Write a protein that binds this ligand. Structure first.
Ligand SMILES: [Mg+2]
Lengths: 48, 183, 387, 529, 148, 62
């Protein structure tokens, strides 16, 4: 339950739902090279 | 055996179980109770009761082999002044003599006479609507008329305006039974 | 001794004053001190054995002896040999020893039953009560009509003839002497019981229905009827019995109906089986299928109500509505069918027993599409006219 | 590469051509930190399910099961051969179980020598009878099916998978809890060595004699399947002549297939029950499955009794041809053989049609395995790249790379996942009266206080009413705690996750200090409070 | 010296529920005078036991008559005399359970001692006055002889 | 087949030969009905406590 509740609260901690997609993780400003290390690289670096 | 009075007291010392304990008929031995003949009054009244119950529980073939020791135990228990031991002696004084337990217990018991009289007159005044035996459930109607006489008629509380649907479907499946028989 | 005899007197007087409805209630609290000590048990056995030797009330007293002996049997007593000693079967030592050994074993021995047949099938039979004792016939019920446990059938005719002698023959006790006996019905009883035993052996469904017709013709016999009753009890009470249904086990449930129709004395046992089946919840099934199975069980129990076991049926309805509340749809369906099957005149006790269940729990919900005949309105009118 | 099966078990390694990678750090501090963090005794137990993951491999598991069977009587020469391979052996021979006529030890004695430390545990065997628990003989096991160990001495019980494997609260798990991880590693190695040597002496095989059954039960199987087949043909004829009444909630076709599935499931279950009743108790299949090493009771049923009905996409095999599963059957038939039920066993062999159906099932399983592995790899990569940034700071809270607080404590408790343990709470579920009789400690019952406490203790408790006030205050507090527990758990469940297993520490303290609780207590309740 | 218990017993029933293990079997006994109930595992292979057999029993602490109370190590080279010189079956193990038919008000009248003989069980239910000698977690023996 | 002196046939859907007939051939050639035999330890020399299955087959290295 520690890990499960930690996953769910890290999902919901931004005041709204966070589906594990580029379509969310690009919207959170959690590091341009985190975004680059995600599946899209050139667009997120190029926007940063 | 040696110190068989204290031995039997140890075996039957469990007074929390007022019935006949198991395996006492197997534990009993002819010479052991031949020694209990002369050490009989030393041991306790409850132990006397359990020993009498064990001698009653003893198999009939052993009883036939050693009728006399049971006679000695019967007369010792009759000489005993405990009311319960006396009643047990009265009930099993005819057990080895004939085979059945004693039915003529009418001697020296006015409480038994009074209770027998009031129970006989009570069942005489209330014998109507005699509630049926399980053995009369087992046997059929003809033997019921033979033994219990007339049967209790059913008592009806309402009117059946039409034949029930359960009986209707029972008749329908009886017709289907006739069909499945004729295929 | 005096206190126990006086308490025994008061309890027996209360039981005899009450009767059957008193029999299902105060017998555990009577059995708890007449079975507490086996010496007290033997004294009571002597007393009411003399009472059964008295002819008037002897049937009711012998029934009390039977149920006290049964209660001692599940309590832990080994007084089968003692009951035989009270009985006349102790006059014959070999018969008493063999019957006591078989009762202590609680099963059936082919060699012992050949011994019983051989001391039977004779020109001088013993007094029939040693085979009329119901615990020995309970042993036959357990051994014979089980769905499993097939017997070796070497002495099958001996078993069936022993049941026929136990449930068929009569005698006339003129000064404790038998001079007139009947033996013409034991052959038909043997044929019926043998047919039922072959049905239990072959245990198979189209041929089961085709022989179910002849089975009903045998169900006209009472020993056949309750043997089939307990066989159906075992078969249904076997778990996962409900894997295929056409009308929620209509063959066995119509066997229940025919048993209740043919014999009015089997209604308490039929009721016990039905309430056990209703109390048992079967999992791994559709909820709607379980709902309709409970509805069909209520259909059979309303059939019992039509055959006339109406006061205990309404009593069990009131009890099951008070504690462990079942479905309101089931209660409404039972009430609607009971009002369909009843008609005036009405007994005041029956109306009082059926009242609170009728005026609680959505009378407007019970009224759905009656139209032509108003069940509850006429019941209100008859109740107000009576009271 | 040469390595241990206790390391293969977490590695998912099974020696069918699987090769491993081996990295060696160059830097000495990296070597030291790898030594002191990623080492096998230091990480015996996983955090995710607080269970041991080293385990015991199948062959040594079955061998130690046959070694811990009750009737093991071992010769002096063999015990002599065995007790070199204990690394942590003290060097003294133990007393034999049998001394006269011949000196014979026992496997429980040898396993008591194997187990280091002094650990108290009770485990249940896989074939342990719950009715034997309910009735008498709960402390004298007729089948030795109650695993009991006390003070580092294995009392009774046949060890199995449920007692020695990855199960929660296992013997190796509580050993890693209590004594040193290096000691538990030596315990594993000693088990492997001596159980391998006892298996070398004993011998363990599988054969056709083990896989074959008897003709009477074979006839039982044929009668059962014939009854089921004629019953389902009766149901099919009922549907043909349309006496079938459809169940509400589904169509007649769905009701019919539900009936067929119910009948076939009941028949197959009865067949398996009959076989497992008649496995004759000398089958190595039975022995190894009871050890819990591999296989299953249903696998005995397919290999011996009958394969049974195979299902594709959660249903029967559809009509791939024109309303027929095969051209070998007629058009529009719904027989179990024609639709995918196998009437034969593996020992009996299969017709080519049901062999094709088993191929259907095997291909379905294999395609499921392939797509499962691929998709779970992609999903795990997604989850990792999602939450590669969350870690706990020195203030015991959870912050991301943005240092935003998410959890005030780790898992809202700040307690380690390896340290947390299953626990049963007795406060929640019993009645108020039972709670009072179990937690009040009434001081008025003078006989009870004489039996429980000493004479000075009872006279001081009765003299000081302030102590009684403190006990009553504690009782009110735990009543409020019971109310709090009934609030937090509306469900009637008493299982919880807790860092400590207090019952085990009670047992360990008792057997360390030799309490002998027949004597009255010597500790004051005010001291307890 | 060291005898915790000594009595006569009779094998009346052997493993009536079933025959599970091949080279060991459990036997049921009742004391001739002390009302002691006994169920004991025994090796049929080396010590054959027939039903209805009469045998003699001593549970003792140490083997020797001197009451030395040895540590319990297997020392076949010792020559101090013991009861095992004349005895025919000796069995050693740990007692693990001693319970009683007791409540909060009254003491234990029936005492039950469950002893584990390494891999063998013995349960002795009987009278507390004779079973006060047993105490939990002690080295005890069995001292079986079979008497004619 | 090795004890008999002939090449065995293992056609799948024959259904004319079975394990009972094979055990009959084993009893004919004198060996055990279920193909188990007694093995002897190479290190100690004591017999293996359990019977051991043995026999030829066809293996391939890869
Ligand atoms: Mg692999």
């Amino acid at each position: 339950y520690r890990h499960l509740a930690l996953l769910c609260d890290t999902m919901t901690c931004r005041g709204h739902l966070m589906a594990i997609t580029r379509h969310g993780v690009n919207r959170q400003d959690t590091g341009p090279l985190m975004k680059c290390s995600f599946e899209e690289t050139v667009d997120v670096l190029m926007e940063a | 055996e040696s110190d068989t009075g204290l031995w039997l007291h140890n075996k039957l010392g469990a007074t929390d179980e007022l019935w006949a304990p198991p395996s006492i008929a197997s534990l009993l031995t002819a010479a052991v109770i031949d020694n209990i003949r002369l050490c009989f009054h030393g041991l306790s009244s409850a132990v006397k009761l359990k020993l009498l119950l064990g001698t009653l529980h003893l198999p009939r073939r052993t009883v036939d082999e050693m009728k006399g020791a049971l006679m000695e135990i019967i007369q010792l228990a009759s000489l005993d002044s405990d009311p319960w031991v006396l009643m047990v002696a009265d009930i099993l004084k005819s057990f080895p003599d004939t085979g059945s337990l004693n039915l003529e217990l009418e001697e020296q018991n006015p409480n038994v006479q009074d209770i027998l009289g009031e129970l006989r007159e009570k069942v005489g005044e209330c014998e109507a609507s005699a509630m049926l035996p399980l053995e009369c459930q087992y046997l059929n109607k003809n033997a019921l008329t033979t033994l219990a006489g007339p049967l209790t008629p059913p008592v009806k509380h309402f009117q059946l305006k039409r034949k029930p649907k359960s009986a209707t479907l029972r008749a329908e499946l009886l017709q289907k039974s006739t069909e499945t028989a004729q295929q | 001794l005096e206190v126990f005899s006086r308490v025994l007197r008061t309890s027996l007087a209360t039981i005899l004053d009450g009767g059957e409805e008193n029999l299902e209630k105060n017998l555990p609290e009577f059995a708890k001190m007449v079975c507490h000590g086996e010496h007290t048990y033997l004294f009571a056995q002597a007393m009411m054995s003399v009472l059964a030797q008295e002819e008037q009330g002897g049937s009711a007293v012998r029934r009390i002896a039977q149920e006290v002996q049964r209660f001692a049997q599940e309590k832990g007593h080994d007084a089968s040999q003692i009951t035989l000693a009270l009985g006349t079967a102790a006059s014959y030592p070999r018969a008493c020893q063999a019957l006591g050994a078989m009762l202590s074993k609680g099963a059936l021995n082919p060699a012992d039953i050949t011994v019983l047949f051989k001391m039977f099938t004779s020109m001088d039979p013993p007094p029939v009560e040693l085979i009329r004792v119901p615990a020995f016939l309970d042993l036959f019920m357990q051994s014979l009509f089980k769905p499993g446990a097939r017997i070796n059938q070497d002495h099958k005719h001996k078993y069936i003839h022993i049941l026929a002698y136990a449930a068929s023959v009569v005698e006339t006790w003129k000064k404790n002497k038998r001079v007139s006996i009947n033996k013409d019905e034991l052959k038909s009883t043997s044929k019926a019981v043998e047919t039922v035993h072959n049905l239990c052996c072959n245990e198979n469904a189209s041929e089961l229905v085709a022989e179910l017709s002849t089975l009903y013709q045998c169900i006209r016999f009472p020993v056949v009827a309750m043997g089939v009753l307990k066989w159906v009890d075992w078969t249904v009470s076997e778990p996962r019995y409900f894997q295929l249904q056409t009308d929620h086990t209509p063959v066995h449930l119509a066997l229940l109906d025919e048993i209740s129709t043919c014999h009015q004395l089997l209604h308490p046992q039929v009721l016990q089986l039905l309430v056990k089946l209703f109390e048992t919840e079967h999992s791994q099934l559709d909820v709607m299928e379980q709902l309709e199975l409970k509805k069909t069980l209520l259909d059979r129990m309303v059939h019992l109500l039509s055959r006339g076991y109406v006061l205990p049926v309404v009593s069990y309805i009131r009890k099951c509505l008070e504690k462990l509340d079942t479905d309101i749809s089931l209660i409404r369906y039972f009430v609607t069918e009971v009002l369909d099957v009843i008609a005036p005149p009405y007994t005041s006790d029956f109306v009082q027993l059926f009242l609170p269940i009728l005026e609680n729990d959505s009378i407007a919900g019970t009224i759905k599409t009656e139209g032509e005949h108003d069940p509850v309105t006429e019941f209100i009118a008859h109740c107000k006219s009576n009271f | 590469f040469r390595l241990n099966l206790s390391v293969t078990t977490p590695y998912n390694a099974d020696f069918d051509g699987d090769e491993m990678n081996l990295h060696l750090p160059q830097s000495l501090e990296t070597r030291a930190e790898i030594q002191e963090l990623a080492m096998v005794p230091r990480m015996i137990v996983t955090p995710q399910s607080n269970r041991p993951v080293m385990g015991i491999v199948q062959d040594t598991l079955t061998a130690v099961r046959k070694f811990t069977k009750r009737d093991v009587f071992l010769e002096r020469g063999e015990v002599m051969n065995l007790l070199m391979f204990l690394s942590t052996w003290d060097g003294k021979v133990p007393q034999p179980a049998i001394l006269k006529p011949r000196p014979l030890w026992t496997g429980k004695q040898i396993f008591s020598l194997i187990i280091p430390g002094h650990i108290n545990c009770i485990r249940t065997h896989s074939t342990h009878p719950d009715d034997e628990d309910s009735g008498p003989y709960k402390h004298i096991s007729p089948g030795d099916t109650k695993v009991v160990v006390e003070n580092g001495e294995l009392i009774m019980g046949i060890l199995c998978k449920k007692s020695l494997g990855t199960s929660a609260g296992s013997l190796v798990h509580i050993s890693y809890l209590e004594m040193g991880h290096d000691i538990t590693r030596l315990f594993y190695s000693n088990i492997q060595t001596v159980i391998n040597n006892w298996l070398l002496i004993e011998g363990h095989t599988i054969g056709i004699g083990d896989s074959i059954a008897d003709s009477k039960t074979y006839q039982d199987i044929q009668n059962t399947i014939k009854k089921a087949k004629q019953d389902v043909i009766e149901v099919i004829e009922k549907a043909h002549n349309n006496e079938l009444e459809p169940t509400p909630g589904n169509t007649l076709r769905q009701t019919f297939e539900n009936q067929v599935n119910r009948i076939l499931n009941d028949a197959r279950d009865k067949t398996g029950s009959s076989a497992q009743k008649s496995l004759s108790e000398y089958n190595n299949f039975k022995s190894m499955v009871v050890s819990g090493a591999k296989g299953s009771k249903i696998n005995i049923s397919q290999v011996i009794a009958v394969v049974g009905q195979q299902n594709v996409e959660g249903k029967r095999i559809p009509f791939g041809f024109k309303h027929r599963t095969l051209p070998h059957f007629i058009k529009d038939d719904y027989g179990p053989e024609s639709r995918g039920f196998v009437e034969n066993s593996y020992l009996a062999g299969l017709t080519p049609t049901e062999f094709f159906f088993h191929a259907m099932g095997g291909r379905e399983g294999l395609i499921d395995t392939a797509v499962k592995t691929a998709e779970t790899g992609y999903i795990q990569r997604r989850l990792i790249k999602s939450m590669e940034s969350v870690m706990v700071k020195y203030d015991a809270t959870v912050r991301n790379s943005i240092n935003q607080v998410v959890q005030l404590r780790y898992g809202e408790d700040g307690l380690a996942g390896e340290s947390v343990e299953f626990q049963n709470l007795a406060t929640l579920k019993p009645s108020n009266k039972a709670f009072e009789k179990k937690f009040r400690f009434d001081y008025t019952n003078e006989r009870a206080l004489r039996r429980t406490l000493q004479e000075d203790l009872v006279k001081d408790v009765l003299s000081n009413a302030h102590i009684q006030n403190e006990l009553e205050r504690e009782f009110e507090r735990m009543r409020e705690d019971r109310e709090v527990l009934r609030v937090i758990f509306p469900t009637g469940d008493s299982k919880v996750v807790l860092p400590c297993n207090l019952l085990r520490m009670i047992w360990n303290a008792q057997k360390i200090f030799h309490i002998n609780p027949r004597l009255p207590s010597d500790l004051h309740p005010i001291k307890v409070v | 010296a060291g005898i915790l218990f000594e009595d006569i017993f009779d094998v009346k029933d052997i493993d009536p529920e079933g025959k599970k293990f091949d080279r060991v079997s459990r036997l049921h006994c009742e004391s001739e005078s002390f009302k002691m109930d006994l169920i004991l595992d025994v090796n049929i292979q080396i010590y054959p036991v027939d039903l209805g057999d009469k045998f003699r029993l001593v549970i003792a602490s140490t083997l020797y008559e001197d009451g030395t109370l040895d540590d319990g190590e297997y020392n076949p080279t010792d020559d101090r005399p013991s009861r095992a010189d004349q005895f025919e079956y000796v069995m050693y193990g740990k007692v693990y359970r001693i319970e009683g038919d007791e409540t909060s008000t009254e003491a234990a009248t029936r005492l039950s001692a469950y002893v584990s003989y390494g891999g063998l069980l013995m349960r002795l239910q009987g009278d507390a006055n004779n079973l006060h000698g047993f105490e939990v977690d002690s080295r005890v023996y069995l001292l079986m002889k079979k008497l004619a | 087949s090795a004890n008999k002196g002939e090449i065995g046939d293992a056609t799948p859907f024959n259904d004319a030969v079975n394990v009972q007939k094979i055990s009959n051939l084993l009893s004919d050639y004198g060996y055990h009905l279920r193909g188990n035999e007694v093995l002897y330890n190479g290190f100690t020399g004591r017999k293996i406590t359990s019977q051991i299955f043995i026999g030829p087959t066809y293996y391939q290295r890869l």
